[PDB]
Amino acid sequence: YDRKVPSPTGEYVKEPEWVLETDGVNLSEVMTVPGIDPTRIYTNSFIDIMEVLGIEAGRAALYKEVYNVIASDGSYVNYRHMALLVDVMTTQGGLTSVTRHGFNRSNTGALMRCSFEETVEILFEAGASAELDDCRGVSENVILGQMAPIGTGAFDVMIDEESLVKYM
Amino acid sequence: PQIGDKFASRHGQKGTIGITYRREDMPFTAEGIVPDLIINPHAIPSRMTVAHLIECLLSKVAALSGNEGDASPFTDITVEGISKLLREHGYQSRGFEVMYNGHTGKKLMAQIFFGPTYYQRLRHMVDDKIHARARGPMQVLTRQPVEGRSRDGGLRFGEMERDCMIAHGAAS
Amino acid sequence: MSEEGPQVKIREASKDNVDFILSNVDLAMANSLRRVMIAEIPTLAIDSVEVETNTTVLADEFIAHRLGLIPLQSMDIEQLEYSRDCFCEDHCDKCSVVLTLQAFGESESTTNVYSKDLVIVSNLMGRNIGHPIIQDKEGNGVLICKLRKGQELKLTCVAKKGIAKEHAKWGPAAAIEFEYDPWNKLKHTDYWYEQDSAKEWPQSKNCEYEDPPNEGDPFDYKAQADTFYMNVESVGSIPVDQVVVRGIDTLQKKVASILLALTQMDQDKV
Amino acid sequence: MLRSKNCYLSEATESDLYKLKECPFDMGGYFIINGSEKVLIAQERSAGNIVQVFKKA
Amino acid sequence: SLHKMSMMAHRVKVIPYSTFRLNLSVTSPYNADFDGDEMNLHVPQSEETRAELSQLCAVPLQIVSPQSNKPCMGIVQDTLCGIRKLTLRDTFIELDQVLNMLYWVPDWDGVIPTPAIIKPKPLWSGKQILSVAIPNGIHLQRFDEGTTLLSPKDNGMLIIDGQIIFGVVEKKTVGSSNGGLIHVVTREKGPQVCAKLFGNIQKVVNFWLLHNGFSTGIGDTIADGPTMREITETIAEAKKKVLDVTKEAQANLLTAKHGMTLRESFEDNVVRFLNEARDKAGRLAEVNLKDLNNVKQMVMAGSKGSFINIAQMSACVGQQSVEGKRIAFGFVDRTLPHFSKDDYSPESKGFVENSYLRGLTPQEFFFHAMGGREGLIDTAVKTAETGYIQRRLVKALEDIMVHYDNTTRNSLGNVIQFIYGEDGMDAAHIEKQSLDTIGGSDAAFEK
Amino acid sequence: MNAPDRFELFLLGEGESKLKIDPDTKAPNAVVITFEKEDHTLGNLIRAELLNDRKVLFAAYKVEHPFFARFKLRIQTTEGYDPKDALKNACNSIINKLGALKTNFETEWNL
Amino acid sequence: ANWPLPVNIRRIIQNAQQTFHIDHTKPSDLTIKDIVLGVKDLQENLLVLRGKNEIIQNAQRDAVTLFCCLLRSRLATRRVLQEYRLTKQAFDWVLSNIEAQFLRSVVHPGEMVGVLAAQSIGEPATQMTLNTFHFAGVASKKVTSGVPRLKEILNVAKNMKTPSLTVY
Amino acid sequence: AIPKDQRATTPYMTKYERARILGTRALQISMNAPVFVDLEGETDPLRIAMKELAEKKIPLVIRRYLPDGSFEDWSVEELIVDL
Amino acid sequence: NTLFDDIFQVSEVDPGRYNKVCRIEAASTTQDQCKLTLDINVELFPVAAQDSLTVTIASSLNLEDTPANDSSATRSWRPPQAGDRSLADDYDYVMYGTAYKFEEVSKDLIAVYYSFGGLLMRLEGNYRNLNNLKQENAYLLIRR
Amino acid sequence: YALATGNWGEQKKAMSSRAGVSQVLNRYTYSSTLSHLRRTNTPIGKLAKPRQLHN
Amino acid sequence: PSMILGVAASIIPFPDHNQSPRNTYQSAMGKQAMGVFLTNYNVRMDTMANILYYPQKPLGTTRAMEYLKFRELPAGQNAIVAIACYSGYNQEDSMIMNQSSIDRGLFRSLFFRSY
Amino acid sequence: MIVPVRCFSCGKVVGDKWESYLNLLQEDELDEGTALSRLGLKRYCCRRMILTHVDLIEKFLRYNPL
Amino acid sequence: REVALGKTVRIRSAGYKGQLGIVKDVNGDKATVELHSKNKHITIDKHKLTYYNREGGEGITYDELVNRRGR
Amino acid sequence: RGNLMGKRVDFSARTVISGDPNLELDQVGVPKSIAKTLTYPEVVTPYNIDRLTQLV
């Protein structure tokens, strides 16, 4: 492989280097092998990245994996969207899958949760417990048929007497 | 037939009528021949429909000569033979023709491909698809608008439209 | 030979086609004349069909369309008033022609119905209109429908004045050939030569008629299209010379109407 | 089934078909039940009495 | 409705026909064509909804897509080819046509521009009318490969005070490019100005193309004798190389690349040789084509077509592949009953050495049918899979809010990003720029 | 069915005028004339004849939509020349040319 | 060096050169002190947080580091005095336009960024072509990419089809 | 819970706020509310609302809700309109 | 209103993938540093290699009676009349264009770039000696 | 019942029986009728192998 | 070799010069073509029946459809087609069709519904 | 079913040419092109009108009427 | 109880002269009349169109007020 | 999932779309029948009393 190592004179030049590609995931023991660089070892599997590294390293690896996924079709996606997605997926201390066993098992409102997966199970759970739905989400307001506090609904409009008597 | 009716050829080139023109407004050749249909050339390179042009040339040759043209696959018929026959008839080697604008009668550059082509009318007509509802019949259980053009139904505002409107920020 | 206006030269004449050359005339005038001749000449055609008995295998709309597509004599068409401008309820003798068609199956073999079977029951008042045009050696005319023994067809048709712009059934011309500048002296088009332009593109039949072949002279940028070769074909309702005369008359009438409207609006403004 | 050995149209000629108000271009092969034409779609199944070997996961 | 651009607010215009009519430039965000598509229309029932739809979901307000940071609308279809042909150096327009085109463009000041050539005959260049359509105050400068201030190939772009100086307008200027004219107009002037520019350009290009004409024919995909001879020679050389590789492998004299067996390396070499031969034949066919070719003209404009289309239509069709490999042995060591056992020749394994114009033999016809069936099945599965994935993704992040403290929080109020995008900037208001400090040498930086 | 009547494209409706002139403020001595029920046939001829004049500085026409048979004609003349006078002169020249052409064609056909 | 940034300085300076006609020959009116003070004032005038406490001030300071670096690169004294030759009024106009564009480029509070990110990620997924094969380089490892890879990333699969590892 | 000297929100006026204010003013005008500016013969409530917003003559107050629950009140006439 | 005048013997004419527009390079026969590279329409002006073409750059086409003025910009160009007179009557090829570049090469040579609606011309000469009165919006007249 | 509803079996247990065996004849076009009279279907129900065109 | 095609695919002229998806689309859409489905109409009572006014044999016939009776019962018409960019009203997949031909009886049909 | 009265493209009347076309095909043993040329159909637009026409009226007439 | 209800009528004058239709609805001076050949509905003044018999015969004007019958 | 977050609505229409180069960027060609069917409620105001009376 070729790396853009800066030249001693100041410019950037391509310095070829040897790169080892492996078909297995055992980075816990590979990093301890002498003669390699432990500060540059990378694994395409982000699940075990945080087993030896931190949660932030796992989030960075997940973002890199997503960027590599959207790389061949030629489409360009702004960094903010993918960064927000990976931050949501790593808000807690571990990976939060986008499925019924991941972001679903949260502390959000039951009404907003139960609109995607199976419903009656979570409704029965809510009935058995006594949790309170704050109704500050979008799904709850859609169900109740009220203006959700999003976009134009993020604020309140009031009338003032002082300005009313000011003009006339 | 009217605007919106679906029409297609024998090569998977489907489409609908967008506009209609009279004989005077249509382009004409030096012999006074006007086309029944006009097709955009942009549909050819993407779909790789060479057989459309080959069949057009073969149909032109057959109409000029009066003998049925053989379009069976895996035969010895080549484009060169059709071109030679067309040149012998004295029209063009490749089927291009010189037409005129018609609106002004001026000569048109970029000579146009011409020739008969088989076309078929599909079962999809705009008359059977246009729908509009404004406070029509009412359901019983859900008390929501009924479904179906025949019973004056209403279009469904699905979930995808809901998140689209949410992303737009239009809460009201 | 009348003034320095457009000049004509008839090459070939016949009962259905006329070939002439237009000179000392601009392209716009020739194009407008062609458009008027193809879509502005008033003619006579069947517009309303009343069906009494139809036991044939063809639908009523089918027979109505076929009858409406049948050409009719329109020589004295200027003596017939438009239905919309006529002071009558539906149709009278001064604004329409009534034709009746009766067909029955007597012989065991198929009995064809032709356009010659139409009979005019109205009063033409000496006008030469309404007669179906039969351009055929046998004299039968346009075939309408075929019915076998037992089947009976009986209907009444009404012919009214109209122009080709409203419907294509009122068009008196079939196809009009329009061409100018047989050689590319004006450079109005770019040829699609693959190896050579001269060999690949056949020469038009109008190349020999005047227009001497170009040489290696510099391109003339001060030249304009002034010679046009036209061939007008008539369906049969109107003679070709009458078709051209009526086209010129219609264009003149349209321009005169524009001038009259301008004068009227000027008078109203003042 | 139409145009079968037990059908009246098996031995009918063109004139007989025309007299019986039947299109000579019709090919048959369909059942007429309750006034509606029904066609049995062929069902595709694996052949029996055949030894087959496959490898599991 | 995948993205927010699938929902737009338009202005009602009553038309005398029973169909929906829309501008050709809005089809790209809608991802719709006119082969029988169906689209829904909703009307508001109150002043609140009407005003918020007009001020939030208007079509000109969504010219720049926040997803790809590029405009989602541009000049497409025959308008692109018309604008490419109009801006050619040799394109000249006479007085009457110039007057007609000037009158066709609305909001025209009524001032006739001075013709480029005045002495022999008054002639207006094609770029003059487009510059008239383009509003003043917009400056653009794009340099392509080998482009200078006196570029002989008429490439690149340079606009000063809304006047075209040099460069043929193509998909890189009036398309969906980030640095295109549409993006600059939208960023400098208002969205209404951008919509007016869209309309004026479309009208003028359509009027010019109506009286000029553009067509295509069978002969556009026909090459001359020497080109076909060279293509056949290249195909024969590739077949000879493949045969030599097979002979070497059969004698066990071919080394195996590390990490793979002999079969995988042999198949990789064969497919590489076949793809290289197809690419070379296509490049030769494209080079042979003249500038007057309709397919080539469409290719330069970028409206439709590509190099691979020309290659497959004129020179040679690519090797048919199923599941990423050549045609497998459906029979016992055979692909078709018409071949012999253990035949590894490219013809027997699914290589189409013919072209669409020339015609296909039954074997390659069957192989192409198999490839097309595989492609159709792939799209049929993929559309459903991506739809489910999109639904899950929308459900996952359906309650993320940017609050008045410039922090992004969910419904529960938990903070997931202390500042949106780590910079607090709107996606639609970001443009690609070059940092001059990072690059260069130390001496150049000091100088 | 929303299909318009076929006669609506060549018959003047109630409350409609064949000609309607509006002054143009973009340039001095410029007017815009809107015609009804015409489809390019008089427009091309009138534009060509107006351009044939020497006192006319601008002459163009356009059809906004093929659905409606109506075109707008814009004429700009030199100082002291009324555009209506130019239109009348062009119409008179067209009438004279058409009459001469008809007479010549009749004379040629007579032999 | 090519990275997306909020405000296009090059377009602003080109517009300011086109207007306020530059003679390119007469000496400029800007002084070193004026240029430096204007650049510093423009840097201080960029507000994205508008706080008073130390934490918000630090966040605002370090949230515009890239833009400040770009502004310093594009508004150097030598660059202004040699290439972008402007006058005092032109320099003030450039500074005002840059500040106005930066303040107008801030994200409006109340926007649904999660839905926008989800749509911006899901649209290329639908727009992608077949992604089951052909993802092989020098060695035909059949690396998973595209729709299946995206699905397994979103589901956080513990057993990926083609695990990989890179050693430097 | 209505601070004034500690208002950390942006002084500019957001697109959503502008749309909501224009809609509310237009609806009130449509339902026959008093108008504090001359109309110049205009008859469309929405354009009247835009004209009122142009000279900042709309007697409305924007209440921006903080995520915790606190809020600050911003007058329409004191909000800078730049979009 | 004249701003330039030379002989400019032309050589090496080769349009390149074109049929109506040719690129001609010329060098002045008086000055050893003057150079020209201009695009012309050979359909109306069919020049050939090794030819002398007197060129002239003028700010306006008005006669010497009317001095140069800035009121001639955006005048809504009118078709030429019969009795009108202009400097173009003495030449065979007149083109209108705008200057868009002023580059400095070596120490005393400057290049002026013009665009006549798409046709570009590059002119070189001695700074402050020959090309010292060229600003923008100048005609180009060529004589056989 | 079997020839009308298309469920091959008795009246009861129709849920566990195959469906679509019997279909109404398509008589829109002669070619359509000919195609419908020579149609085969394999009851499968995610899998790309059975849908591929085998050699 | 041409005998391997089906009933729908036997109508396509020169199927070997087209891409496989195009052939599949044409085969699928051929069953929706409107024409004379049977000569027994006018005596039958079907729910829907669409027949063509003037069906025409294709000019580019194929030997395979001789036994399919396609020439006896065609499902289309021979229309003159010009491939051009005229007026910009036929973009994408739209087409421009002559009004005079429509008035003269081109592609018009009959509709039958039974209760 | 029956021969169209007029040519779709241009508008030439071909309603009496069907019987003559059949007679020329079955008496004089001419090919289709020569018969078309003899009938006067020069443009291929008119030639295709009767060259590719199906006479389905006879099949309908085969059925017994009422 | 309008007389012009469910009666075969013929439209005179205007652009629909000679057409045959049946009155469906009456709205004051304007009445809705369908068309036989054309599949559309048009509204015209009831005093304009003539009145015919259901079976067929002579036609009369709007004088049917004095004779509440057909024909 | 079928009656709360997604439901059928009134004042909506659906018909085949088509292209029109003469239309503006933000403009949709509505058929006359659809316009005559779909309605919008407008509150009568002194600024539109005459227009509303004419429409009625």
Ligand SMILES: [Mg+2]
């Ligand atoms: Mg589509």
Ligand SMILES: [Zn+2]
């Ligand atoms: Zn009368």
Ligand SMILES: [Zn+2]
């Ligand atoms: Zn014809």
